[PDB]
Amino acid sequence: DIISVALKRHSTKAFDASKKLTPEQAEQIKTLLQYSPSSTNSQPWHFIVASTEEGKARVAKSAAGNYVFNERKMLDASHVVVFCAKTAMDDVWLKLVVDQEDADGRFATPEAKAANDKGRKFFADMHRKDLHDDAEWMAKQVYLNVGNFLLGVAALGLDAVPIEGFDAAILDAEFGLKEKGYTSLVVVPVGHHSVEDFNATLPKSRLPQNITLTEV
Amino acid sequence: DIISVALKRHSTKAFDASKKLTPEQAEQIKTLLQYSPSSTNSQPWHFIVASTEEGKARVAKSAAGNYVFNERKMLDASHVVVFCAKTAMDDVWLKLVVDQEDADGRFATPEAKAANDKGRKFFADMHRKDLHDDAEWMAKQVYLNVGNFLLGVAALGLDAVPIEGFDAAILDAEFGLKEKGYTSLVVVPVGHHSVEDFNATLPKSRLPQNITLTEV
Ligand SMILES: Cc1cc2nc3c(=O)[nH]c(=O)nc-3n(C[C@H](O)[C@H](O)[C@H](O)COP(=O)(O)O)c2cc1C
Ligand SMILES: Cc1cc2nc3c(=O)[nH]c(=O)nc-3n(C[C@H](O)[C@H](O)[C@H](O)COP(=O)(O)O)c2cc1C
Ligand SMILES: O=C(O)c1cccnc1
Ligand SMILES: O=C(O)c1cccnc1
C-alpha cells in the first residue's frame, strides 16, 4: 500500500555501488519522469539520467568543493537524475506540446485544439508579462515532478535522495545547459542504500497536523 | 504497481459529489500531506482540508473571474486540499522543526542536534539573506509535496485534479492566511470522477523522451 511506502521511505545518505537497477527498473524510472503532470501540461523540463561511471562523475563535479560530501551519493548510486527546468517558455515549445496532444488524439475538432493552445498561451503570457515569475513557475512544475518521482521510486522498492546541495552553475556548464535553454534544480541519486546510510534506521520526523493542517 | 498508477491517473474534470472518501481514506490523505519530504525537512507549509459543504464553498470563492470553470470541481469533490506556503522563513519555525526532530528521537547527543540546527539555518539564511528567494524556495517544497500527493491519492484509488486556476488573493483573504503567515498556491479536489469527466477516457499525452531526456 502507498501509505506504508510514504512512511517507510527515507533520504538515503549512502549507497551500495554494487547494486544496480535492473534494465526494467531503469526503464520504469524514465517512465516516471516523463508522465508527471504539470500546469497546462507545459512539461517545462529536461532530465539528465546518468548511469555510467563517467556520466555520474560528470554530475558529481557539481558537488566538488563546498558540497564535496554529496559526491559519494552521486557516484555510488546506480542512476542519478538531474532535474532541469526551461529558462524561458518559448512559443515553439508551446506548439510542441499542443501538437503532441493533438497527435495523441486529445482533440475532437480543430476548434478544441485552438482553444487548448489559446488557454495555455494565456497563462504562459500571464506568468511572463504580468506576474514576472515564468522561471519560478516552470521550476515549480519541476519540483512537482521530483515529488512524484521520489514516491514512485520508493514504491518500486528503490532508495533515493533529493539533492539541492550542489552547484547548479557548475552542473549547467558541465552539460552546456544555459545555451540549450535549461538550468539544473535538483539531483536525485537512485539505487540501494549501504550499511553506511545512518538515516535508514532513524525514526522519521514531521511536525504534528495540529500545527500544519486546518480542517473545515 | 506504481507505474500502472502513474500511467492511469488523470486530472479529473468533473466529480461525483455522492462518492465520498471513506473515513480511513480521509485520514490517509492527511498522512500523505504530512509525510512529504522537503529541503532540510523545513516543511514550510500549511494545508486546508475542506470536507463540509460550507468549507468547500469558502474555497470555491476563489474560482472567480477567469477561473469560474473550476468552481464545480471545488464544490463537487469529496475533499478539497489547499496547499499553502509560508510567506517568510523565520527562526521560530526553524526551532520548531529541529525540536520536533529531537522529540522524535533523531539526535543521540546535544551536539548532533546543534549541528542539524546549524546546517538548516545555513541554507535558510542562504535563501532568505543572500539569494532573497526564500518565498520561491519554500513554494518549491510545497509543489514537491503536491507531486507526492497526486501520485499518492491515485495509489489509494482516488481521483483528483491539481488547480492553479484560482484567485489566491480571494482564497487568502477568505481564510485570513496572510496574517497567519501563509499564501495559497495549489488547490486539489479529491474524490471520485463522474461520467461527465471527459478527461477520464481521453488518452494521456506527453512529449517523447527523445526530446526531454538525455542518458549519459
Ligand atoms: C528538494 C530537496 C532538497 C534536499 N537536499 C538534500 C541534500 O542536498 N543533501 C541531503 O543529504 N539531503 C537532502 N534533502 C533531504 C531532506 O533533509 C529530507 O527529505 C527531510 O529531512 C525529510 O527526511 P526524509 O526524506 O527521509 O523523509 C532534500 C530534500 C528535498 C525535498
Ligand atoms: C500545478 C498544476 C496546476 C494545474 N491547474 C489546473 C486547473 O487550474 N484546471 C484544470 O482543469 N487542470 C489543471 N491542471 C491539470 C493539467 O492540465 C494536467 O496535469 C496536464 O494536462 C496533464 O494531464 P494529467 O494530469 O491528466 O496526466 C494543473 C496541473 C498542475 C500540475
Ligand atoms: O492546466 C490547466 O488547464 C490550467 C493551468 C493553470 C491555470 N488554468 C488552467
Ligand atoms: O536537507 C538537507 O540536508 C540539505 C538541503 C539543501 C542543501 N544541503 C542540505
From Swiss-Prot, chains A, B:
Recorded GO CC terms: cytosol; membrane
Gene3D superfamilies per UniProt: NADH Oxidase
UniProt key word Oxidoreductase: yes
Transmembrane segments: none
Cofactor: FMN
Catalytic activity of the protein: 5,6,7,8-tetrahydropteridine + NAD(+) = 6,7-dihydropteridine + NADH + H(+); 5,6,7,8-tetrahydropteridine + NADP(+) = 6,7-dihydropteridine + NADPH + H(+)
InterPro entries assigned to the protein according to its UniProt record, in alphabetical order: NfsB-like, Nitroreductase, Nitroreductase-like, Nitroreductase/BluB
Activity control summary: Subject to competitive inhibition by dicoumarol, nicotinic acid and acetate with respect to NADH. Subject to uncompetitive inhibition by dicoumarol, nicotinic acid and acetate with respect to nitrofurazone and nitrofurantoin.
EC number: 1.-.-.-, 1.5.1.34
An example molecular function term from Gene Ontology annotations: identical protein binding
Keyword set, alphabetical order: Flavoprotein, FMN, NAD, NADP, Oxidoreductase
Listed GO biological process terms: 2,4,6-trinitrotoluene catabolic process
Keyword flag NAD: yes
Binding-site residues, NAD(+): 13, 40, 70, 73, 106
Purpose of the protein: Reduction of a variety of nitroaromatic compounds using NADH (and to lesser extent NADPH) as source of reducing equivalents; two electrons are transferred. Capable of reducing nitrofurazone, quinones and the anti-tumor agent CB1954 (5-(aziridin-1-yl)-2,4-dinitrobenzamide). The reduction of CB1954 results in the generation of cytotoxic species.
Protein family according to the UniProt entry: Belongs to the nitroreductase family.
Subunit structure: Homodimer.
The protein, known as: Oxygen-insensitive NAD(P)H nitroreductase
Naturally occurring in which organism (per UniProt): Escherichia coli (strain K12)
Gene name in the database record: nfsB
